[PDB]
Amino acid sequence: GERVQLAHHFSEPEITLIIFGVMAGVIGTILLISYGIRRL
Amino acid sequence: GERVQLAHHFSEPEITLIIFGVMAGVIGTILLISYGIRRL
Amino acid sequence: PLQQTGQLFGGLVRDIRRRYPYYLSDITDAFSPQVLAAVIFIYFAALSPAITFGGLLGEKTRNQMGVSELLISTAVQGILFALLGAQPLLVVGFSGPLLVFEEAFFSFCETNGLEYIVGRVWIGFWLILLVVLVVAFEGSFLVRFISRYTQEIFSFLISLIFIYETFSKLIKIFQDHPLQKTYNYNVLMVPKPQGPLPNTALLSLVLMAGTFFFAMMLRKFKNSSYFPGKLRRVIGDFGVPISILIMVLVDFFIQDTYTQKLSVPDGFKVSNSSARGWVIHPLGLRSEFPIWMMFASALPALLVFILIFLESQITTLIVSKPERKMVKGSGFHLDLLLVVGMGGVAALFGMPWLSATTVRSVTHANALTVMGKAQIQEVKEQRISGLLVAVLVGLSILMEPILSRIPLAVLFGIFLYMGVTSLSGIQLFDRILLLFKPPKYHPDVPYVKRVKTWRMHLFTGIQIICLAVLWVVKSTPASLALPFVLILTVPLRRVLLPLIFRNVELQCLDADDAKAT
Amino acid sequence: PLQQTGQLFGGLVRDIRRRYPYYLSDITDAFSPQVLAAVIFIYFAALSPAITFGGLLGEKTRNQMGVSELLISTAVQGILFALLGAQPLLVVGFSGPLLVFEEAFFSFCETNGLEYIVGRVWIGFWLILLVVLVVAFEGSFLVRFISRYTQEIFSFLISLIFIYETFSKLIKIFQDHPLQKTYNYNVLMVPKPQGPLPNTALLSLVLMAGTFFFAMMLRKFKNSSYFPGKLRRVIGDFGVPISILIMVLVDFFIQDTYTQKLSVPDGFKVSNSSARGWVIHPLGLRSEFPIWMMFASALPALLVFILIFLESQITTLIVSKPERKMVKGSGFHLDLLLVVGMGGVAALFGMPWLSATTVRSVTHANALTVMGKAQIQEVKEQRISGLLVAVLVGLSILMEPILSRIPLAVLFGIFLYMGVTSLSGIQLFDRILLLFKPPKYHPDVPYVKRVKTWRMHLFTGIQIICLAVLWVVKSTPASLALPFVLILTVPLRRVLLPLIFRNVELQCLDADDAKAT
């Protein structure tokens, strides 16, 4: 980073991987729900 | 005229009348000569 | 292109199936001098808004986002869009609504003790989720309900705003260096002159007017009957580069008088190294980013998604009209995905999200448009021009010794040319001109020969009221509501207009392909 | 008109019989707004050369003849010519060659210790003799040997010189007030600024360009399809007055910057009251005028007669072309008599002799020309417009508060408009433009469809050689030999051209009425 930055438990790659993983889970849940609807 | 002007024997109208009369005489002489030619 | 398949990401797959087969032609069709002249034109047309908006953004956000971030984001997103996009003729860059949103969000973060750049990171994170879902469910099929009505209202409004801002820049130049009887001959010049200077405003006016005059004259000369046709068309294609060169030389040979020049940053470095780095931690830089703002970022993400979606999709509608002779296809789903996803990713680097700007894209399409023996014959649909424009924008920092000698007034004349020439294909501008003509001089078009004159004038006047309403909204603090007021025109055409116009009148006046019903 | 009757004063009598029946129409035909717009146009077009040439004349002759003398001579001769001439559309005034002759004669009198004004009186005395003899013997029938060749060479050269002088005036403005980094804010302004001033030259260029722009745009608007036709034609008629008014208002609302304004003398008085009065004695003012110079004044009188004769008769030929739709007739013998006799009489009063100026008269004819629905429909032939122009020139001293707020730069733009619009009827200019067009774009005219393209270009380039030779003569001390070099084009057309061109080619190219051989 720049100057002095607060130290977090997750680093930038770790935190962005976590965020992208949660986003992918949300997208997959939405797509599976849409797949379940319009069929029954 | 203006300022101090040289004194002439003829004033401005007199001299311009003399000059116009001379010019008219010359023009009339030329026209009468032209009338004489192209006839004999 | 706007049909709904019903299959997840079906619209995305169709757009790639439509345009990527032409990828080989997208490289070979660029081998013409008109493409190079378009590169030189759109380079300045894209660099100058980048520099101006970067300066304004750095002023308004304490340089947390500035010129260098904007230039790098513009270059990278333009390169990736030209390499992968389905409508390569779009020009991707920063815009006025995005600047207003950045101002509002910085003010909000200042009020609530939030880090503005980390908030932007989370807005970008929510933007990726939105555009994936919209593309997944073919949400870009809703663009089919934006008829020529809304398209032309938006296009005419954006062109008018562009011309107004171009003239206001010259007005500001005249205000900063007014015509005075006496001047203080000892004025500090760094960073900018601290007082009025002689000859500056008048020379700026002369440069702008001369650039506009030369551009219009060479545009006329292109269609003229002078010179061999090949040489004439070559000079006509290079009309804007030749005008810029002539006026830049004129200013270069006038040494004593000061004129404002282009100014790029020294190097590829963050505008404030004391604030942030190249990568912003989503959890915070100085303070911990609160959890509630991680979820509350969806609403600004919704607003930014709406702004980018409306701007880019309407621009794609305008540039891909059937009457512009675009025979290669455009992808509404793929371009939306690329633009919004690239913006969301760029937010992670503290770099701006971009949009398909209307004036720049229309100017790019017109510069690549070939005119036959009048009538549009073809368009040089290729990916090399946009890629080269983006590359030159990225290299703008390194070519400072050249950009530092180009006055802003010359670029103002170029902007005036862009604004006036962006009005050619708009039927609203044509019908406004019919208000000032006798009815016997009206052209043989379906909306003249099949519609009564006062009925057509009433239809045009209703659009002018929409233009005034949208213009008022922009000039208010609620200028981020402009996309919604523009959206309101779609019910106006589809619900209210049939109450006062017949179907044949509406088909003649609002036709997707300029047809006679 | 150009036939020789063989009776003394036959052409003079025929001109009186041809035109004076139309005298009632020559007054009633001026009841239209177009004539008023023409009056406003030609008033400035005649006043500004009068002031400029009078100032130069006073500088070069120590104010023996100056601005007031030229204004009074212009007014009186214009009134008399409009009331009595057989071509009232001619504008009578001072020209460059007359100024050159005045310079040379003043230098001659200075070298020999002769009174310059008395020598002018005797030159005017000999001028009356020459014109009476020429009119008596119908000497104006030699104008029939001046074909479209010599007419168009003369007209194109005079238009080129007019445009060049208009641009050189702006160059002189820039030289007087150069663009500098620093100026001395304390500069004495009376009588004229004694040092460079800021913002002056650039504003002068802006005013000139704006006046030219508005004039050309209003001329285009006249032929346009906008507005009701009657209002559109009225606004197009007043295009030059409207442009002058707009730019004068623009300069008026700029208080701080200096621009050079129109300057007329305080009253109707001689420029140098210590040199001469209103009436100059033919025999001498201070010293007795020598008798030998009374007879030796014939040679300068012959030179002046040749200058005035060629200028006036070629102007009458150009304005009264059969293609310009003049259906009222023109008198070559009467107009020459009036102009030269009035010049001789004005010599007696220390006033300049004048000539039928080319650009001024062509501008006067074009301002009164009515266009069809492209095609010249008719001409507002009348005596009122020239009479009113001369009356306003005479009253220009009394309306100093109006003229003192009119910049010369606005008049420079009007002069540029006059120069560019004076090229419309010249086929030499049309063929010069065909040197830069493909032959497939050449118009359907007899000299194109009946002559090979390279033959027409050879004929055109021969005329360009004549133009270059004439231009070289103008830029030499022997510029008074220009009429003789111009007359030499008549042997070139009637002798040397048939050696390299066929009869049919010459008939198609050099045609008296633009007919297909």
Ligand SMILES: CCCCCCCC(=O)OC[C@H](COP(=O)(O)O[C@@H]1[C@H](O)[C@H](O)[C@@H](OP(=O)(O)O)[C@H](OP(=O)(O)O)[C@H]1O)OC(=O)CCCCCCC
């Ligand atoms: C600097 C250029 C070279 C200078 C050397 C000067 C020597 C020189 O250049 O002559 C060759 C050429 C003559 O050949 P040519 O008249 O046949 O050339 C035609 C011309 O190019 C047209 O523009 C073309 O139509 P378009 O536009 O495509 O619709 C037409 O093609 P097409 O469509 O009918 O099949 C061409 O045939 O020049 C000229 O064009 C005349 C104007 C020259 C003006 C003089 C140059 C200013």
Ligand SMILES: CCCCCCCC(=O)OC[C@H](COP(=O)(O)O[C@@H]1[C@H](O)[C@H](O)[C@@H](OP(=O)(O)O)[C@H](OP(=O)(O)O)[C@H]1O)OC(=O)CCCCCCC
């Ligand atoms: C400020 C003026 C007040 C305007 C009040 C606004 C109300 C208003 O003025 O319209 C009514 C009237 C319509 O009447 P109309 O169309 O019949 O008038 C025709 C028109 O004047 C043409 O120019 C004429 O042809 P040209 O040119 O000679 O060849 C033609 O004469 P003709 O030869 O065919 O027999 C005329 O018939 O005017 C307009 O022309 C529309 C222009 C609207 C534009 C008005 C924009 C201000």
Ligand SMILES: *[C@@H]1O[C@H](CO)[C@@H](O[C@@H]2O[C@H](CO)[C@@H](O)[C@H](O)[C@H]2NC(C)=O)[C@H](O)[C@H]1NC(C)=O
């Ligand atoms: C870079 O960022 C720092 C900190 O964000 C800015 O320093 C601030 O400057 C403003 C303007 O006076 C004031 O709030 C304080 O002086 C500073 N605050 C803090 C917290 O440091 C600095 O101005 C920025 N640099 C630029 C060029 O804008």
Ligand SMILES: *[C@@H]1O[C@H](CO)[C@@H](O[C@@H]2O[C@H](CO)[C@@H](O)[C@H](O)[C@H]2NC(C)=O)[C@H](O)[C@H]1NC(C)=O
């Ligand atoms: C008016 O005319 C007089 C002479 O008639 C001029 O006076 C002369 O000025 C020149 C210029 O220096 C010199 O020859 C003498 O100083 C004067 N000579 C005589 C005989 O008077 C006077 O300059 C003229 N006025 C103007 C404004 O030029």
Ligand SMILES: CC(C)CCC[C@@H](C)[C@H]1CC[C@H]2[C@@H]3CC=C4C[C@@H](O)CC[C@]4(C)[C@H]3CC[C@]12C
């Ligand atoms: C739509 C995009 C932005 C993802 C959705 C955001 C929500 C659902 C998720 C994504 C990543 C998540 C965070 C990941 C890491 C941590 C650090 C931990 O000590 C507290 C919870 C916290 C702070 C999570 C809170 C909820 C969170 C912000």
Ligand SMILES: CC(C)CCC[C@@H](C)[C@H]1CC[C@H]2[C@@H]3CC=C4C[C@@H](O)CC[C@]4(C)[C@H]3CC[C@]12C
């Ligand atoms: C064509 C016009 C100018 C006429 C030609 C000029 C000749 C023929 C005439 C015109 C007027 C004449 C002058 C009239 C009066 C006088 C005064 C006299 O004491 C001496 C001779 C003198 C000075 C004359 C000399 C000749 C003269 C100059």
